[PDB]
């Protein structure tokens, strides 16, 4: 009864909730007075104890379960992969795990960094767009005003002042072209980095399950040495 | 959007001393003007229009003052720069250029909008361009709260305005514990009044001796009596003269901006009670009401430019939702096989039925186009019901999430939504291995670059709405019409159990059965609510009826019902109503950090909690201050930006003149962030003598001096910060090399409080843990003090003001244990004396005082031993522990004591060993080396015993304060699992007598490890 497999000593609830995570409604284990944890609707129900309510039909706890049995349990033992070779693989599976662990963190260091830089670029582009809009309105302001002046100076012989107006105009538009060029070189940097992000993601999603199952198997190799 | 730089120009921290700016003129010319980095816009506009005559069309340029500069900021905003006092460096420009234009619209309105924008760290125009009707509703409807608050404030002017500003800084009860009362002479206190007489500030002082419970008006009366002494008035003339004038004056704390404007016993004011317990002599300054009331602005509240249903219970079908398709997902087709959409309907983090997946589909193309059928009925949906879904990889057979998203099944109009829904999804947190994330933010990622899953909700030929209350009340009588002597004993014994205690499914039925008896033990309510089945409409509708007519409970208890386990709007409104009616501003201020956090759990923007806090913030400017900062600190955060921004907007639009003061604080904080950002990135390699030189050089400049002088301390806005003492400013030798800053206290009478105001600014670390730990420590002390256990703690100020940026309050006349030993001249010994500390105290508190200092050390030492144990602060050393000259010990630098908590590679749980160092025991025992058996030590152990039991006895409150923080963001408070430890330390599963012996063991186990040689102090050899 103490030996029987579904009994998990006197453990904390964090440990229990961990194992009942992600199971089908039915799975169970008993723990310490005796209580029984169980799945129903995808929740961890708690049920005290021999019997539950009034008619205490049973003689021991190991019987009580087996009547309601008429639920596939969590096993203290069942650790499907000599003490010498298992002591070795703990150094091997734990190194294989810990090498991936540090590769994941460095992937996250990129992930985060790269995420922020993208958002920055997106702001910068919004800025350039508004900047450029303002210069384009300055262009239309120059036409409105230089219209009446360029015609006057053209009517006079004075094309010295025509040359002075259009020195300003050429600078303005040359400046616009430079700003548009800067927005464009950022648009390519943004698209390049967005793909670099999408890629860094694909690598993390591919190394995420690898990290989980390396912990599952490694944890059960420790459970064999302590039993 | 909000900017990540505090640089003066995009991607550049500091502007070169001079730079070229392109100035676009209103006649369409473009000139390039070399400018000083620090030049004002007026000196820039003057110089421009001068040089603009060299260029063509100079004839079209009207008067210089007819025009306004425009540029594009680092928030990609067209800012119109109305305030031309501002400097080029402070303009937060994207690109160095300006446009000269004719000013357009309503000048007043536009200026205020800028001020609101700057304050909240986000331009107001971004809110205008948001379509979600919930958003635009919130913005309009919340002004009801603003109008109410502003009315209260200008109701009984000008006293009411002076009340909003300068609210009385008051303890929650007027009563004094005996240890405080015994401290009084004879129930009396000696007080020093002050008056400013001559234009050049000549000071007279009146020394009154009054009863502690005199209200300020009576203090003033006794002051009048002392001055009218010897003026040949009769009893009648005098009594008439006091009555007439006692209320033409107000008292103020000399040294800071605290006032005694309300009829509370003087003892109840925190400044006084502090003086009482410190043995200091209150120095109040008397002045006429007009002197204050005239200085109050009398602000004005502009109203902004923004101004066939079937019930749910008549739709008897099963719930079903259709997963159409996603846009993409970032998975490698090599390695990973197939992907599916997991779903679930949830009540908080409690699922209401079984979780339902879709069929597998290959990575490369995600299209499902299938209805998922859910195992509950549409009438059986609780009001706070939510779909929580994600997308999962499949590779034994190893499942993992990819993107996730949650949805409220009813909108904010109670409308069970139908039709098509796009839902841009979120990335998974760091360590989340769970398929679903129901705790995560509810709603759609405003990042439209993310994977986007389309959904279809079932249509029912009309608008579906959640039932009225009348409908729900009826159904309660339809639901019902269908004990023992140890029972009442049993459900008394489960209200005394803590929230984190686990309730059996039997005890749930027990509770539900006896739900009518429970109304007589109304503090059971939280437990009963967990016994309810929320998927059963029948139970819910009955519970709605109980709650509606439930007895109010202590606000400390109502709080529990605002954490994550209580999503139901009816349960929450109850809590808010308990808080509305029974929560003092003292306690609101003390618990404000949790109350701000649990706004994030609210489903909808407009709600009862928000409206409660917003009102108190707009009613009490002390609360408003920390309201603003607690919110501002998180505006960087993707998740909450829009909510908090919206809330900040409503605050900033009605808070009054304080908006101006808050800008000054913000601007100051920005310069500090920028300055220190340089020292962290571009000059991290450079030596600490070179950094000091650079620091000095930058702080000297006039743009920085203007910014960082003459503003209010964010740690405590009663405190003014005057001129900087740059000689006393310095880079500290600690983690993240924080700035140590020093300001003159510009108070006329600063010498009577403190003449220098010292703050640590620390850029780099997350300070939320320190904030929370200090809050706890304060509350612990408040409990102790109120029960008449005189244990003195020191919860110094700490405030996060951004993403890993905050302030720490310096305490004066204090030193780390290390610093104290080095002072005593080590002599190069590998082991420290161990009497050094006691020696230092003797030297500091000679003869007369001595016993008082030992007392204080003993009492403080006791408080921190208990606090440190219960909370499991293992990581104490001789640079975490500090002692004041008067003997008061306290702990600093939290935020690292949870780093080694999680197990690894099976190394067993890191025990938090309760030990006390021998040096401290020696001090307690006044120099005796047999310090484990003195009267001093027993008396000390007893202190600890009582303290421990007092916190245990209030365990529920601490559990709830932590519980409210779980959805905050702190990586170290993630789940009820993280708090569990406290149950062990307080021994909540044992008896009280068993807990005392547990603590007694733990404490006696410590000093078995005495005379531990400690053979080297630097390296621990
Ligand atoms: C003269 C100087 N005085 C002082 C220094 C630090 C703190 C303090 C007073 O009291 C306020 C509490 N405090 C808290 C911290 N710190 C902390 O909490 O984390 C790191 C460290 C500081 F570097 F920020 N430092 C102090 C001293 N003894 O060397
Ligand atoms: C979480 C958390 C705690 C819990 N304390 C411990 O778990 N201590 C402990 C135990 N074992 C080891 N090895 N190290 C530390 C508890 F106080 F709630 F118990 O206190 C906190 C606190 F004051 C502030 C904060 F922001 C978070 C927390």
Author numbering:
A (entry chain B): 328 to 359, 367 to 383, 390 to 410, 425 to 435, 441 to 586
B (entry chain A): 2 to 308, 323 to 410, 416 to 502, 523 to 1061
Show me the paper's own sentences about this structure.
Comparison between WT and H1047R cocrystal structures with STX-478 revealed no significant difference in the allosteric site. Kinase-domain alignment revealed no conformational variability in the domain (RMSD 0.3Å). Similarly, a detailed analysis of the allosteric site and key STX-478 interactions showed no difference between the WT- and H1047R-bound structures. Because X-ray crystallography did not identify structural differences in STX-478 binding to mutant compared with WT PI3Kα, we asked if differences in binding kinetics could explain mutant selectivity. Surface plasmon resonance (SPR) assay results confirmed the potency and mutant selectivity observed in the biochemical assays, indicating that STX-478 has low nanomolar binding affinity (equilibrium dissociation constant, KD = 4.7 nmol/L) for the H1047R mutant, 15-fold lower binding affinity for WT PI3Kα (KD = 70 nmol/L), and intermediate binding to the helical-domain mutant E545K (KD = 47 nmol/L). However, SPR analysis further revealed that STX-478 has faster association constants (kon) for H1047R and E545K compared with WT PI3Kα. In contrast, duvelisib, a nonselective, orthosteric PI3Kα inhibitor, showed approximately equal binding affinity and kinetics for mutant and WT PI3Kα. These data indicate that STX-478 mutant selectivity is derived from kinetic differences in binding between mutant and WT PI3Kα and suggest that the allosteric site occupied by STX-478 is more accessible in mutant forms of the enzyme. Although X-ray cocrystal structures did not provide a structural explanation for mutant selectivity, differences in binding kinetics provide a strong hypothesis for kinase-domain mutant selectivity that is somewhat weaker for helical-domain mutant selectivity.
